[PDB]
Amino acid sequence: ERILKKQPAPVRALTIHPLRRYESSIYDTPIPAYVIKHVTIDIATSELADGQSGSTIQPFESVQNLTLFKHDFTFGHLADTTDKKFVEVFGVLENRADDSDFQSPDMIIETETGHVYVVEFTTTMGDANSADLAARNKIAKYEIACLDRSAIKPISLYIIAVHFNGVVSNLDLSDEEVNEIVFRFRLARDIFEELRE
Ligand SMILES: [Mn+3]
Ligand SMILES: [Mn+3]
């Protein structure tokens, strides 16, 4: 029996924390070798020093999944790929299903206190300004569904947008957390360019 579910109700509203720009600080860090075979990927995680950026990378990968490989690999240490829909957490609104019910952000996290956290990941091959635009596009994509459902349980909407030299996010990230996202993105780009052949 979970006593945190017995609290007075929180304000039912949508919270969006402000987007911040983060720069990576990877510097001259070893990047693991990879071997691609017809795909399977063996990543030489033995080459990394204990605790350096990249410690979340697993040595073996299997890859219909090629188009989203860069996205899924970059954020794989934070969330596995999902098809969890708004409707699985909230049910339909106004007694009629619509397109918003079947949107699927990267994460929908429910807490005992009754808040819901919606998290969306995205990438860009451009610069930091491109990453900010990508983050704002994902806010635009999910803001209507999150606002409407905040009437049921309060929602906070979080975005992580990665580029080659940093992250735009409204999470409060450490240098090491920024570096892990960027490090994985850079490696995913290297692998993807060879996979596309
Ligand atoms: Mn997704
Ligand atoms: Mn995404």
Tab-separated table of C-alpha atoms and ligand atoms in Angstrom:
chain	number	residue	atom	x	y	z
A	1	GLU	CA	0.000	0.000	0.000
A	2	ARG	CA	1.630	3.210	-1.313
A	3	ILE	CA	0.916	6.192	0.925
A	4	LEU	CA	2.208	8.685	-1.647
A	5	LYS	CA	-0.934	8.001	-3.693
A	6	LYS	CA	-3.078	9.347	-0.815
A	7	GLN	CA	-1.984	12.997	-1.034
A	8	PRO	CA	-4.090	16.084	-1.791
A	9	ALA	CA	-4.255	16.638	-5.528
A	10	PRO	CA	-1.574	18.738	-7.269
A	11	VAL	CA	-2.459	21.602	-9.587
A	12	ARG	CA	-3.547	20.098	-12.907
A	13	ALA	CA	-1.565	22.075	-15.475
A	14	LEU	CA	1.238	21.812	-18.010
A	15	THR	CA	4.752	22.842	-16.889
A	16	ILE	CA	7.465	23.562	-19.463
A	17	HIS	CA	10.884	24.400	-18.031
A	18	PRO	CA	12.995	26.722	-20.232
A	19	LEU	CA	15.314	25.231	-22.840
A	20	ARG	CA	19.023	25.617	-22.093
A	21	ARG	CA	22.058	25.290	-24.341
A	22	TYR	CA	24.819	22.914	-23.245
A	23	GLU	CA	28.227	22.506	-24.863
A	24	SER	CA	30.042	19.186	-24.925
A	25	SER	CA	33.504	18.897	-23.373
A	26	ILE	CA	34.633	15.541	-24.709
A	27	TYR	CA	37.985	16.896	-25.939
A	28	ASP	CA	40.428	14.157	-27.009
A	29	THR	CA	38.604	11.030	-25.680
A	30	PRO	CA	39.033	7.519	-27.140
A	31	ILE	CA	36.199	6.406	-29.409
A	32	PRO	CA	35.595	2.634	-29.608
A	33	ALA	CA	36.194	0.700	-32.795
A	34	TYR	CA	33.252	-1.094	-34.400
A	35	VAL	CA	32.943	-4.016	-36.818
A	36	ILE	CA	29.811	-4.216	-38.990
A	37	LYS	CA	28.808	-7.543	-40.557
A	38	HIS	CA	25.830	-8.528	-42.698
A	39	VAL	CA	23.533	-6.026	-39.614
A	40	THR	CA	25.460	-6.943	-36.475
A	41	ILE	CA	27.818	-4.502	-34.716
A	42	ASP	CA	30.657	-5.460	-32.357
A	43	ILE	CA	31.797	-2.352	-30.470
A	44	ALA	CA	35.237	-2.472	-28.838
A	45	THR	CA	34.159	-1.257	-25.414
A	46	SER	CA	37.429	-2.657	-24.024
A	47	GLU	CA	39.188	0.344	-25.597
A	48	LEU	CA	37.484	2.841	-23.276
A	49	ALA	CA	38.979	3.911	-19.961
A	50	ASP	CA	36.911	3.256	-16.856
A	51	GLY	CA	34.560	6.190	-16.341
A	52	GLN	CA	35.333	8.042	-19.582
A	53	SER	CA	32.513	9.181	-21.844
A	54	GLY	CA	30.942	6.191	-23.570
A	55	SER	CA	30.816	3.885	-20.545
A	56	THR	CA	27.103	3.310	-21.178
A	57	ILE	CA	27.767	1.700	-24.584
A	58	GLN	CA	27.166	-2.048	-24.824
A	59	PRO	CA	29.501	-4.209	-26.951
A	60	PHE	CA	26.984	-5.916	-29.269
A	61	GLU	CA	24.074	-4.612	-31.334
A	62	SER	CA	21.570	-6.035	-33.800
A	63	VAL	CA	20.018	-3.663	-36.324
A	64	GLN	CA	13.638	-2.078	-40.622
A	65	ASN	CA	15.396	-0.234	-37.777
A	66	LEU	CA	18.080	1.533	-39.834
A	67	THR	CA	16.150	4.766	-40.387
A	68	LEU	CA	15.892	5.495	-36.643
A	69	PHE	CA	19.268	4.026	-35.679
A	70	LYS	CA	20.980	7.346	-34.930
A	71	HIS	CA	18.111	8.460	-32.684
A	72	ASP	CA	17.655	5.158	-30.857
A	73	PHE	CA	21.368	4.535	-30.274
A	74	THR	CA	22.066	8.079	-29.071
A	75	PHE	CA	19.477	7.919	-26.292
A	76	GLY	CA	19.640	4.172	-25.597
A	77	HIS	CA	21.137	4.667	-22.135
A	78	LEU	CA	18.091	6.738	-21.120
A	79	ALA	CA	15.251	4.788	-22.690
A	80	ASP	CA	14.678	1.810	-24.896
A	81	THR	CA	12.574	2.353	-28.001
A	82	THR	CA	8.875	2.545	-27.175
A	83	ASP	CA	5.411	2.521	-28.715
A	84	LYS	CA	3.634	3.655	-25.536
A	85	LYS	CA	0.723	5.938	-26.474
A	86	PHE	CA	-0.891	8.738	-24.492
A	87	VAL	CA	-4.074	6.644	-24.473
A	88	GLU	CA	-2.375	3.865	-22.502
A	89	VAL	CA	-1.699	6.309	-19.656
A	90	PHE	CA	-4.708	8.666	-19.782
A	91	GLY	CA	-7.501	6.933	-21.690
A	92	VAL	CA	-9.390	8.844	-24.386
A	93	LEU	CA	-10.594	12.424	-23.887
A	94	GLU	CA	-14.202	13.535	-24.424
A	95	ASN	CA	-15.324	9.895	-24.788
A	96	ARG	CA	-13.951	9.742	-28.356
A	97	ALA	CA	-10.536	8.641	-29.598
A	98	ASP	CA	-8.588	11.036	-31.818
A	99	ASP	CA	-5.075	11.451	-33.205
A	100	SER	CA	-3.702	12.917	-29.968
A	101	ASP	CA	-4.545	9.686	-28.135
A	102	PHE	CA	-2.212	7.751	-30.436
A	103	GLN	CA	0.831	10.005	-30.281
A	104	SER	CA	3.860	8.291	-28.739
A	105	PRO	CA	6.576	10.490	-27.207
A	106	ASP	CA	9.846	8.799	-26.296
A	107	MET	CA	8.919	8.559	-22.597
A	108	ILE	CA	5.731	8.915	-20.513
A	109	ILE	CA	6.647	8.495	-16.835
A	110	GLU	CA	3.971	8.278	-14.121
A	111	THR	CA	4.861	8.901	-10.449
A	112	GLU	CA	3.015	7.828	-7.298
A	113	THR	CA	2.441	11.464	-6.320
A	114	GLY	CA	0.442	11.746	-9.542
A	115	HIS	CA	2.632	13.803	-11.851
A	116	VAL	CA	3.307	12.682	-15.420
A	117	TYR	CA	6.599	13.444	-17.154
A	118	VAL	CA	6.680	13.449	-20.966
A	119	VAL	CA	10.164	13.293	-22.522
A	120	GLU	CA	11.017	13.587	-26.217
A	121	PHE	CA	14.430	12.976	-27.811
A	122	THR	CA	15.586	14.391	-31.123
A	123	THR	CA	18.760	14.862	-33.170
A	124	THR	CA	20.097	17.260	-35.775
A	125	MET	CA	22.954	17.085	-38.260
A	126	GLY	CA	23.217	20.889	-38.010
A	127	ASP	CA	24.535	23.321	-35.423
A	128	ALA	CA	23.272	24.519	-32.040
A	129	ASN	CA	20.709	26.829	-33.651
A	130	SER	CA	19.462	23.798	-35.577
A	131	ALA	CA	19.186	21.891	-32.284
A	132	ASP	CA	17.126	24.684	-30.738
A	133	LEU	CA	14.758	24.610	-33.720
A	134	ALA	CA	14.488	20.830	-33.432
A	135	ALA	CA	13.627	21.106	-29.724
A	136	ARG	CA	10.953	23.703	-30.440
A	137	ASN	CA	9.505	21.544	-33.212
A	138	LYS	CA	9.074	18.681	-30.734
A	139	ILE	CA	7.403	21.023	-28.227
A	140	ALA	CA	5.029	22.071	-31.006
A	141	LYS	CA	4.379	18.426	-31.886
A	142	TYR	CA	3.286	17.345	-28.395
A	143	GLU	CA	2.120	20.522	-26.620
A	144	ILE	CA	-1.577	20.181	-27.532
A	145	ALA	CA	-1.854	16.587	-26.336
A	146	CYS	CA	0.066	17.416	-23.143
A	147	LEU	CA	-1.993	20.533	-22.363
A	148	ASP	CA	-5.302	18.708	-22.809
A	149	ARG	CA	-4.191	15.740	-20.695
A	150	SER	CA	-2.797	17.995	-17.957
A	151	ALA	CA	-6.432	18.405	-16.908
A	152	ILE	CA	-6.279	14.768	-15.734
A	153	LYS	CA	-2.813	14.669	-14.151
A	154	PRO	CA	-0.215	17.462	-14.183
A	155	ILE	CA	2.383	17.037	-16.922
A	156	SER	CA	5.911	18.400	-17.266
A	157	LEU	CA	7.214	18.322	-20.857
A	158	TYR	CA	10.959	17.759	-21.339
A	159	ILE	CA	13.028	17.773	-24.549
A	160	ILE	CA	16.577	16.664	-25.347
A	161	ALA	CA	17.928	17.802	-28.749
A	162	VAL	CA	21.482	16.644	-29.590
A	163	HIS	CA	23.918	18.125	-32.105
A	164	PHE	CA	27.568	17.335	-32.804
A	165	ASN	CA	28.817	19.856	-30.219
A	166	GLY	CA	26.189	19.840	-27.491
A	167	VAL	CA	22.596	19.505	-26.334
A	168	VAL	CA	19.573	21.789	-26.112
A	169	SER	CA	17.391	20.605	-23.237
A	170	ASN	CA	15.183	21.864	-20.437
A	171	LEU	CA	16.478	19.151	-18.141
A	172	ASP	CA	19.225	20.210	-15.705
A	173	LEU	CA	22.114	18.131	-17.065
A	174	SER	CA	25.638	17.644	-15.778
A	175	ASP	CA	28.671	18.018	-18.042
A	176	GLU	CA	29.081	14.232	-17.962
A	177	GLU	CA	25.438	13.656	-18.919
A	178	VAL	CA	25.730	16.085	-21.851
A	179	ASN	CA	28.965	14.395	-22.920
A	180	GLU	CA	27.408	10.909	-22.860
A	181	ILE	CA	24.564	11.970	-25.162
A	182	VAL	CA	26.925	13.791	-27.540
A	183	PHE	CA	29.514	10.984	-27.446
A	184	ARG	CA	26.877	8.373	-28.340
A	185	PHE	CA	25.458	10.628	-31.088
A	186	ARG	CA	28.879	11.082	-32.687
A	187	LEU	CA	29.483	7.334	-32.690
A	188	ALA	CA	25.990	6.698	-34.062
A	189	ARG	CA	26.710	9.076	-36.951
A	190	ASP	CA	29.952	7.223	-37.732
A	191	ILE	CA	28.188	3.850	-37.703
A	192	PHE	CA	25.195	5.125	-39.672
A	193	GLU	CA	27.353	6.456	-42.511
A	194	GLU	CA	28.827	2.979	-42.980
A	195	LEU	CA	25.471	1.226	-42.479
A	196	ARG	CA	23.842	3.318	-45.227
A	197	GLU	CA	26.241	1.594	-47.646
B	1	MN	MN	9.888	8.045	-30.737
B	2	MN	MN	12.258	11.159	-30.500
